[PDB]
Amino acid sequence: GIVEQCCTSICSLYQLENYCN
Amino acid sequence: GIVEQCCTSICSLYQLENYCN
Amino acid sequence: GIVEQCCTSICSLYQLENYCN
Amino acid sequence: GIVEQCCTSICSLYQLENYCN
Amino acid sequence: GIVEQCCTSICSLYQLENYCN
Amino acid sequence: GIVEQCCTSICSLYQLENYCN
Amino acid sequence: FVNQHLCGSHLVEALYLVCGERGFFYTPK
Amino acid sequence: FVNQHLCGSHLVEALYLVCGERGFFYTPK
Amino acid sequence: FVNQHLCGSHLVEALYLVCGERGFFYTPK
Amino acid sequence: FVNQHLCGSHLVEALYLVCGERGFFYTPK
Amino acid sequence: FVNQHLCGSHLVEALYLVCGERGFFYTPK
Amino acid sequence: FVNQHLCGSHLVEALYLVCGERGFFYTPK
Ligand SMILES: *C(=O)CCCCCCCCCCCCC
Ligand SMILES: *C(=O)CCCCCCCCCCCCC
Ligand SMILES: *C(=O)CCCCCCCCCCCCC
Ligand SMILES: *C(=O)CCCCCCCCCCC[C@H](*)C
Ligand SMILES: *C(=O)CCCCCCCCCCC[C@H](*)C
Ligand SMILES: *C(=O)CCCCCCCCCCC[C@H](*)C
Ligand SMILES: [Cl-]
Ligand SMILES: [Cl-]
Ligand SMILES: [Zn+2]
Ligand SMILES: [Zn+2]
């Protein structure tokens, strides 16, 4: 999930946008 | 400046990019 | 919504719990 | 103290309340 | 108090030092 | 630079002031 | 309103601490 | 664990900025 | 006042950086 | 040390929310 | 104005996430 | 890398407080 992906690598704005509603 | 443009109205993520290096 | 209830008046820690999953 | 306890384990709200006045 | 002095006007870094231990 | 110095040791206010304009 | 946007940033950080492992939903609209 | 909790705090703040009016659901592991 | 609550959150984070190892006290009332 | 300083920053923010009007004293190691 | 100072703190944190490796400049005056 | 990004987030906030009206340029590695 979001902790697994973005707390092991730097997530860009597009990657962060994936978890939006 | 960024204060006169983004603190008086909400600046979108693209508008904030104008102040990147 | 949380904005109309917690940004117009201070929401206690218990009131914030109403928006937990 | 607070750094020793809560920076090695996740402190809940009740545990954080212990350090209040 | 710190609220009546630093939230009504901007407190410099030196003024904030008055509330250090 | 600033990440190399201040993310390996705690930088004081004077050290942080060095990176100001 | 910028003040509304600033308040929401403190709401989400408050929800993260309050809810813990449960998680939270932030829905302004 | 603490450092994952710290990363999550900055994570929800990033989601609040990126998602905007759409909102988001935060669910930890 | 919510604006007072938001300001206090920035006051405590400012005190933490300013005071350092000395620490600080936050007493609104 | 840096990572303990980072945890302390989120610690005082949590204390500000939890303690509220009572306030708190923050004293580092 | 304190509200201006509070807004600037959210502007710099927004710029840090938005710009990434590019970095940013904050110049109020 | 994540933990350097987290330290940078608190770094720019510290620079915003210390520099004040002078402003600053943030450039990552
Ligand atoms: C340096 O001082 C920047 C010059 C422009 C500042 C504009 C600030 C306007 C006052 C705040 C209005 C909104 C308050 C909620
Ligand atoms: C989406 O826009 C949410 C709908 C309700 C918004 C209410 C905002 C009220 C305006 C802010 C008033 C307080 C300003 C300090
Ligand atoms: C405890 O309640 C502190 C007593 C003094 C509070 C003063 C708050 C003034 C109201 C806020 C004015 C500025 C709003 C933008
Ligand atoms: C909650 O229980 C966390 C579950 C995921 C495991 C995180 C730790 C994985 C190994 C990391 C070791 C590095 C820190 C010593
Ligand atoms: C201030 O001097 C800190 C005192 C407490 C010691 C913290 C470090 C303890 C060992 C942690 C090792 C993990 C990081 C390499
Ligand atoms: C960006 O590519 C970072 C460049 C600097 C290297 C940071 C890591 C150096 C070794 C740290 C190891 C500790 C974490 C496992
Ligand atoms: Cl604010
Ligand atoms: Cl951190
Ligand atoms: Zn704020
Ligand atoms: Zn952090």
UniProtKB/Swiss-Prot annotation, chains A, B, C, D, E, F:
It comes from the Eukaryota. Disulfide bonds join 6-11. This is Insulin A chain.
UniProtKB/Swiss-Prot annotation, chains G, H, I, J, K, L:
It comes from the Eukaryota. Changing residue 10 to D: In HPRI; Providence. This is Insulin B chain. It comes from Homo sapiens (Human). The chain holds residues 25 to 53 of 110 of the full protein.
